[PDB]
Design a protein around this ligand. Sequence first.
Ligand SMILES: N[C@H](CCC(=O)N[C@@H](CS)C(=O)NCC(=O)O)C(=O)O
Ligand SMILES: N[C@H](CCC(=O)N[C@@H](CS)C(=O)NCC(=O)O)C(=O)O
Ligand SMILES: [Cl-]
Ligand SMILES: [Cl-]
Lengths: 200, 198
Amino acid sequence: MGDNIVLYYFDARGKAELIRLIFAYLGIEYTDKRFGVNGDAFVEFKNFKKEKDTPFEQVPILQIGDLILAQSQAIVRYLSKKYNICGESELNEFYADMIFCGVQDIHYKFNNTNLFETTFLNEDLPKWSGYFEKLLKKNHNDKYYFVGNNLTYADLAVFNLYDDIETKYPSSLKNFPLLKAHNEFISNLPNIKNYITNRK
Amino acid sequence: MGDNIVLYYFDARGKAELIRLIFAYLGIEYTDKRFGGDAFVEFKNFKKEKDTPFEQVPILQIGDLILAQSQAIVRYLSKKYNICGESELNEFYADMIFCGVQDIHYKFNNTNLFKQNETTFLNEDLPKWSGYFEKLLKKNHYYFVGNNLTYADLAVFNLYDDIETKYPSSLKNFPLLKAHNEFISNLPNIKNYITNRK
Ligand SMILES: N[C@H](CCC(=O)N[C@@H](CS)C(=O)NCC(=O)O)C(=O)O
Ligand SMILES: N[C@H](CCC(=O)N[C@@H](CS)C(=O)NCC(=O)O)C(=O)O
Ligand SMILES: [Cl-]
Ligand SMILES: [Cl-]
């Protein structure tokens, strides 16, 4: 809706996973195109760039019909605004954005470690986990929202962050109860639960 | 929640400059509060005195309301003052271009500020990304999105204004991008800001 949405990315979670989580949450049907399923992802990406008119030669790429959408954050924000999971006020829209940008700071650090340890594990992670803990405390019953009294993409971003972190470091939410409960809450959402338990 | 707008940052362009350019362009009166007395000490006191979410600047204080994160502040400011995008998809493209600016600005900052080898940026990043922005301007026939100025126009301007502080004549092979930068720089409010800027 549509009517044919194609997400282009490598065979990984990475920069596309939050877009996939947003699609799963909103029940948006789409083609999840992944480079590397058909053997060589490097050649398939090279061919993709010739085929599709990408503005920055990067993925994820969201294609809506002939419409080419690039940049994870821009796509996430575009989808969240279109389907009203960005905040129930002008200021709440900002807070979701602020939190999302904060996620990007600590997620980048995780990406730089996981994909490309000491500094992250001892200095960045616990400090930034404290930041989000305090932000939940500010706003927080089985519901855990970072913004207002409804789900924002910020919730899904923080969930994706620590879900991505907890694949490499499982015990990282032990000392952060609200963040742990937020993870549990988001992971068990009707639309979210099925996607995460059934994804590769 | 109102009146007194105060921007907190270091005495540098960095992550607050675009916000400063946006205030300048819009003609918004604000206190441009810059750290450093001792910057490192003042910032330590700032964190103790202000309730920042991530212990980072820029911080935008509107009354007693605390705003953090450059991009979020920029996007908030653009919506409130109507330099956000003149449609739903125009807002996306502005955001996309802004996100593109961040990708290459980050690469510039790594070499310009954090002592990374300049060659990779100069030979591999800068001209490739300048070509991306050049092509995006070509698609819009200066303005990146729509028929009016968006924050994306100021973001691109800020990007290459920052780049030219260390690497002048980088827009020689990029006429549309060079003319875009020159058009934004000659806007009365921007022109005035640049002249007063140290
Ligand atoms: N600005 C990022 C871009 C993500 C990114 O760096 N994409 C990588 C994924 S491996 C890519 O397609 N790289 C292309 C290349 O290295 O040339 C976003 O949020 O979309
Ligand atoms: N996510 C960035 C954060 C900017 C940032 O990294 N701020 C630096 C400026 S030097 C800072 O306050 N550093 C925190 C510290 O090192 O304690 C944003 O757009 O606001
Ligand atoms: Cl990544
Ligand atoms: Cl910077």
